[PDB]
Amino acid sequence: MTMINGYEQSDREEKIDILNLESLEKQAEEIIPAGGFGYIAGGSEDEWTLKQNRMAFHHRQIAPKALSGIEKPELNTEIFGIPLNTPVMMAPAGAQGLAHSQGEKDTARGLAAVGGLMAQSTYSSVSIAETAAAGGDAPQFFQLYMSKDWNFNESLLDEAKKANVKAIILTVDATVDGYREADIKNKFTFPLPMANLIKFSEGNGQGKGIEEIYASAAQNIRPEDVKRIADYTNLPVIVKGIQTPEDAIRAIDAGAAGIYVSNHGGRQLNGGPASFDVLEDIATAVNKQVPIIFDSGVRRGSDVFKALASGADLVALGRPVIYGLALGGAKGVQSVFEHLNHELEIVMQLAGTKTIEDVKNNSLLNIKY
Amino acid sequence: MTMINGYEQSDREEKIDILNLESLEKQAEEIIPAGGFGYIAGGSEDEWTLKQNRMAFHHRQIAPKALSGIEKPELNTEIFGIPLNTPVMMAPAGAQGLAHSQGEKDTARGLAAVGGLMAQSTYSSVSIAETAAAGGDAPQFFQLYMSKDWNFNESLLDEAKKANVKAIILTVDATVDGYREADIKNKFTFPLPMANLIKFSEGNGQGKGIEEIYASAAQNIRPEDVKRIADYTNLPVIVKGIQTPEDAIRAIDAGAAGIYVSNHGGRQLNGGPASFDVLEDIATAVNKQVPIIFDSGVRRGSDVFKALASGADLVALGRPVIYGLALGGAKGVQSVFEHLNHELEIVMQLAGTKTIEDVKNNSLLNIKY
Amino acid sequence: MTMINGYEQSDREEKIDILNLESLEKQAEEIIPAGGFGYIAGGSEDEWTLKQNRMAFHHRQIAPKALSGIEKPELNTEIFGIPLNTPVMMAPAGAQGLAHSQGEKDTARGLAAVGGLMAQSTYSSVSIAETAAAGGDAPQFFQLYMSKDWNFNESLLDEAKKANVKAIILTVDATVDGYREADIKNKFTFPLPMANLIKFSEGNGQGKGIEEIYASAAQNIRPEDVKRIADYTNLPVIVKGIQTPEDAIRAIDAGAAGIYVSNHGGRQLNGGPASFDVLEDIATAVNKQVPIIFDSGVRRGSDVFKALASGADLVALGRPVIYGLALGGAKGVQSVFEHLNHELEIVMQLAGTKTIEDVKNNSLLNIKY
Amino acid sequence: MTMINGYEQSDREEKIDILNLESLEKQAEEIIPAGGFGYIAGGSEDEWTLKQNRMAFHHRQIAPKALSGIEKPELNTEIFGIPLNTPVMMAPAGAQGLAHSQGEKDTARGLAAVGGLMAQSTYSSVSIAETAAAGGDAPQFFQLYMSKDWNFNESLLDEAKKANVKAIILTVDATVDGYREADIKNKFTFPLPMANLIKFSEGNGQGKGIEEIYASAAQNIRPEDVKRIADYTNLPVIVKGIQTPEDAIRAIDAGAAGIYVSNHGGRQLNGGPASFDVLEDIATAVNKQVPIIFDSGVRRGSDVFKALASGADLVALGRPVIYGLALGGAKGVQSVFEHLNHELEIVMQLAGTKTIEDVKNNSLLNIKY
Ligand SMILES: Cc1cc2nc3c(=O)[nH]c(=O)nc-3n(C[C@H](O)[C@H](O)[C@H](O)COP(=O)(O)O)c2cc1C
Ligand SMILES: Cc1cc2nc3c(=O)[nH]c(=O)nc-3n(C[C@H](O)[C@H](O)[C@H](O)COP(=O)(O)O)c2cc1C
Ligand SMILES: Cc1cc2nc3c(=O)[nH]c(=O)nc-3n(C[C@H](O)[C@H](O)[C@H](O)COP(=O)(O)O)c2cc1C
Ligand SMILES: Cc1cc2nc3c(=O)[nH]c(=O)nc-3n(C[C@H](O)[C@H](O)[C@H](O)COP(=O)(O)O)c2cc1C
């Protein structure tokens, strides 16, 4: 309905009927142009890690609780003193303009509607200021792709601070792009503007070209960069892409106020483990000294419960939210979170867990299947 | 042949040719309306637990016994001093009217014909009194879905006592319904009356609406509820839905006279383990202090043998009996139990086990496949 | 080409081109009538054990030997002082008339041609005397299905002794038939005469009916029956169907001069382990005090090598030989043994094993796949 | 485009677009005659080992490294003081004339273009002198199939020394050919000349027939043969086909200056383990006393990284290079190495490994999938 550089964007704004989150992919495939769809759906190399992100949830099982003496489970929780209606949040994803003309503005509205946490992205088709304006008083985190150019870093961080963002997510697992075959097969050219890079170019970036700003992304990321971002913003800094206990501890020693356990939805180091399979050992080393956010493969209520029980404080979604955004805009995003909340409330009742803390204190079984 | 609220019910009354119990599903799918069929066949979320209920029987193997010195195995056993011709019994299932116009009356007749134990259900399309009348002197258990309304609980328990039921099964693993996609895809409305709720409404329920009685089902179930039902009936109370050793012991401490190991045929907490995979550890903690009933996934003689050898005293069937009920009414149900008895007698002879006690004392192998 | 009771039998007599033994099944399926084919190919219940008989060979691996200093491996071996050109032998199979009009006479000729050991069966379509006459001076074992009628047992054993048989195989794992669905689906009636039962009827059986003789098969088999057959024949008695170390030792204590590790090609106790998976523990308890024969699932050279390396002295084939018999009679059987010998000689060269003893002393790897 | 003995050879000379190395097989299948294609693609028996060569890379996982402080990974390495731009090399393969009229001359050019190590083969369609002339100053190893005729061995070794080859690869795992069904199904006759055997016949072989020279290949290979080749050439001798730690140590004790861990691409001892599954235990026994070369199943960047991290110094490719040779000659071979280098550089950046030594010192995870 909206065209940008030859690419068709959804303008839909409606509640959507959701059977489950996995089925949103084939539904969204009918309306997202083939190149954009492949960009969103695909992982790196032969997609082994992407597939294992789903299958790894079967490595642990939830015990049904008999005679639990609870009813009406509550999804409410908190991070950094911010109250949330649900522990399910939006993973930062820079390609939401591939799904919808409103991009992260509609995603921001959907998260605000369910009282969930929104993460806005460096490469968004819409500006930090626009996305925060769309969300109103709803809490937002800002995901930074750090540049070699500290003028770029400080300009985007100042824009995030002006937009009242509550934390910075430093993404460190994409210093180069994974080898994604879908984009090669589709001969796909990313067709969207990058509103934050355009704004920097027009402001403190003194007219520097967009391709030059893009190419300035840092491949060399050190612990001292974490402390520098923390000192500059006086916001909590969360390191995203952690897949080992040792890296969690190095991040906390470098000044991180949070650990985001992620393999980038299996789009980066193919042949790395399923994200779920390293969560518990990471959480054991962290020992609750900072909040943990988990993503990569979460689709069912049982998956969310298992991630919380294995040491996550919040659980993020990427692809299912992008598909819901294409299918129904702001109300489409709302529908995805409401659907997953419903599947989680059922599991919590059957597992005897009244609150999100009770889920976190739940002991999963470990039979081999 | 019979229509109720637009829904077609079987009136068949015939012996059926059974290749195996798994094949009854595709046979019954030709005659049960699509919505009713999906309601019966389906499990929760992605049906992982439902599938594992079948595959988990491969986690243990039966040793053939050479030079066993036995012939003509005997299927006879006992629970609470009640003699039975077979250790295979009917799992309580509230939806038998979806298969057949006689519902649990035909099931009661089939179980009486093989000298097996019948369990009648709270939500049956036919009354406690009718089902007990159909069974004649055959032993029956009554499955209770406990209400917040103790007038409802005491009325149904009094009706069960008047019908000479020998034990109460308290089902505790369905305080909310699992998320079952088949009913969403089929847009299925349960079309049957609930004869026990209608009777309560007309009697001690003083005209209270059916939907209001239904909605009064307790989500908060505590150990003290078990003792209260035991004190009120002076019958043995069996807790159904136990999937952990700790919950077995809590149930016995609360006054349970039996443990029913079940995950509700994978219809409830999807992402929970296969029922077979927790049976042996539950039976080790119970240490024969009360009888154990096992269900969820039982289809072959080898499955029944493995459940008895892993600590079950009785093994229940759900779906295969519902399918046989659709296909042949009372004689259809009889055919299902006779078929599974035949497969079990073959295994017992080849395994060198003369009696059901010998099966229970059998040591299964544990190679990994 | 030959008709018996409506059933078409092969009369083929030719060398056959063999890609591998597994492919003989689809080749033979083109020429064996559907009912006979299903009788041969099928296993019991859902054929899990039958399938695992094949897959279990992957549980161990053969190390290639570098710098082995050997060439021209030799397949020669010995049992009870009988010289054999190959450790691959014929498993006793009572249904060879379903494949070919000559039945075990052609099988006897094929085994004689490769210098292999033939086992003739109780229920053969052709007599003990005819099969031994067909084999000439080639060594034969006789497989007994023990009757309750010791007049029957002693008559067949006397006939076996007159035919110069070198050992008795007592089959003990088929006291009842496994539940085989193929025969139910095909509505298959065994159409062949049982030449040994007819001969008994005409001789010491004093005209007793064939069905009555057949029905006299013993379901109660005790250790004292083994010693009785040994005392009566003064031949070595091998117990067939052993799947546990304890049963191997009980058989040796009862007077057995050999152990035949078998699950009857997955036709009997479905839900029992793969035959290969219990071989090594049985061989560890036997500790070479008597020869071990292994069968059930052997198709490739690597399978034969792995069975010998895991404690077998001889490895038997059932189904592949029956299929080769249908396809080419005596030369068809010869072709099957020559093909498997060729695959084994290649493995022995690459594994650095000069003789069959070197294979038996080989240490298999145990990586998990 | 070129015909030899009825067989069509590629004459292509072009850069090729590569999605991944696995997809080269179906691309090359469109242009290689069916018999030649089956000869290249196939393994022995049922191809279990061939399949496991691929699946075994999933037995270990690469940890993404957060805050790694590196960029621009370097692929440079060294063997025997020879500088290489990449640790990926050409496995010796005697059938390159089945892909292309230039055979190993084009392969030699492709390896020279990426600064990689070429291995020329005994049975090549082109001579040792021609292949070395094609490669210019690029380093080459010569793979020997040892004869019983030491006049043959010394003539080819003298030709290799004259061609400035830097090491001898003694292949010891093909003393007989594996049973390869593709050649049986295709009725395939190897149609190419063997230029090295023809040259020997015309020179020191004094007119001896090609079939007679071919048939003189040694099946009996001893440790003293390794020392004899080392003494005669004064070159490092690498033993190829090692699959056990014990055989690695026996090879080093016999005078080997290198170990080449290989199962010949699953073409030899089917039922042997996946090559990757024995690499680490071999490397633990070798303890860096000599270089290790690894092959069999390598297709992705993650595979190369995992082999280096598990104790390989160099990683060889067979089939993918043969397919690239068919598709684009010298530039086709170049394209295959450039593609795999690109996938490896991405993994090294995401894993935090600056150099090939850093990859070798990387600790892989070992979760079970
Ligand atoms: C299309 C797409 C774009 C993404 N862009 C970003 C990004 O800009 N920054 C970032 O930190 N992660 C990005 N991610 C990774 C997500 O934050 C998240 O780790 C991933 O989507 C989680 O896996 P899931 O999609 O299976 O839920 C992206 C993921 C997708 C699929
Ligand atoms: C259609 C249907 C209705 C059911 N209704 C009840 C019920 O009313 N009460 C109860 O305790 N269990 C109920 N169950 C669960 C059964 O008691 C039993 O646990 C289950 O069917 C066992 O698994 P199986 O079907 O694989 O044998 C029901 C199961 C099915 C399939
Ligand atoms: C069609 C058929 C008939 C058989 N009849 C007999 C028999 O009469 N006596 C016996 O001891 N075993 C019998 N067996 C079992 C074989 O001796 C042997 O254990 C089996 O075929 C081995 O497995 P395989 O077919 O996979 O090689 C029979 C097997 C088949 C398939
Ligand atoms: C068609 C073909 C011909 C081969 N010829 C030889 C050879 O002449 N000498 C040798 O040492 N290895 C030979 N090999 C084995 C390779 O050196 C190497 O071990 C194998 O191709 C590695 O597995 P991959 O193909 O999966 O990469 C050959 C392999 C193939 C597929």
Residue numbers in the entry:
A (entry chain A), B (entry chain A), C (entry chain A), D (entry chain A): 1 to 369
Question: What are the paper's exact sentences on this?
Answer:
Alpha-hydroxy acids are oxidized by a family of FMN-dependent enzymes. These enzymes use molecular oxygen to convert their substrate to product with the liberation of H2O2 as a by-product. PaLCTO is annotated as lactate oxidase and its closest homolog in Pediococcus acidilactici proteome does not use lactate as a substrate. We describe here structural and biophysical studies of PaLCTO, which revealed FMN-dependent folding and oligomerization of the enzyme.
We generated a mutant (A94G) based on literature precedent suggesting that the mutation of the residue may convert the enzyme to accept also larger substrates. The mutant was crystallized in the identical conditions as WT PaLCTO and the structure was determined at 2.0 Å resolution. However, in the mutant structure we only observed the open conformation for the main polypeptide chain (loop 4: S201 –A219) and we were able to build the conformation completely with all the residues. Mutation of A94G likely reduces loop dynamics and therefore is completely resolved in the structure.
